[PDB]
Amino acid sequence: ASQTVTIPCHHIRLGDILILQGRPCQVIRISTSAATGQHRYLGVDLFTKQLHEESSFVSNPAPSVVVQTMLGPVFKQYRVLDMQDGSIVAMTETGDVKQNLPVIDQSSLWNRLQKAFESGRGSVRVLVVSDHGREMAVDMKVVHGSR
Template sequence: MADTDLDFTTGESGASATIPMQCSALRKNGYVVLKGRPCKIVEMSTSKTGKHGHAKVNMVGIDIFTNKKYEDMCPSTHNMDVPHIKRNEFQLLNITDGFMSLMGDNGDVREDLRVPDSDLGKEIEQKFAASEDILVSVLSAMGEECAVAIKQMTGGK
């Protein structure tokens, strides 16, 4: 009758990490999935309708997590995937073994995010060492998360 090995402990909705959008509706500074990676569109150009009837859209995108450049071409009438992107801000509490302790607005603490291996990561560690109160902006898309920006906390307490 009932399947006893099903796991209902996670609250995943089963929704897709991306939504389809017609290529001609995409815009510069928007987001798109290129070569399986979530990217921000930095360049776009459309070629004329050719002998076989489709205008082609050439796109250049920068991976939002790794900053790698990706290029792709798609007929303007075809669909491309657009990632669901969520940006959250967390207060930095601590850094332990290269992982940040972050507290969200609801008071939940998470310790599963690594300090980025970039100039931003160095800046986070410097500000933490100087005991500055900072907010870390975390971008999440397609099952990945990464700290992308920081800002000084304003004293509202």
């Protein structure tokens, strides 16, 4: 499974990526359970496009501290070396080459990536989710030059 970070429920908005039923999903609905009062998250699996739901995890770590959280994936940042037929050639921080990294079909990512790549290839990074062996670029960033 993907490496994860804990995210307080008050910091979750529609469109955020969460782990729902063990799967990285884009949140499309946030509601309150009538039975438990907890937040319930409905999401679309980034890889399979199936719907998944999961309710928040409530914990009590210290006196008078009551916390609702969810898990989000740890995103990796890769350099883009080339774009070819709906996939990209990417490079990890350590130089490891990924020859056929898929790009999610979401929010015009491929077109935005192609536009930025053609005007400055190596300031272009992709944010990558890695789940059960599979990797996919799910967003992009233009790296500020000073970095």
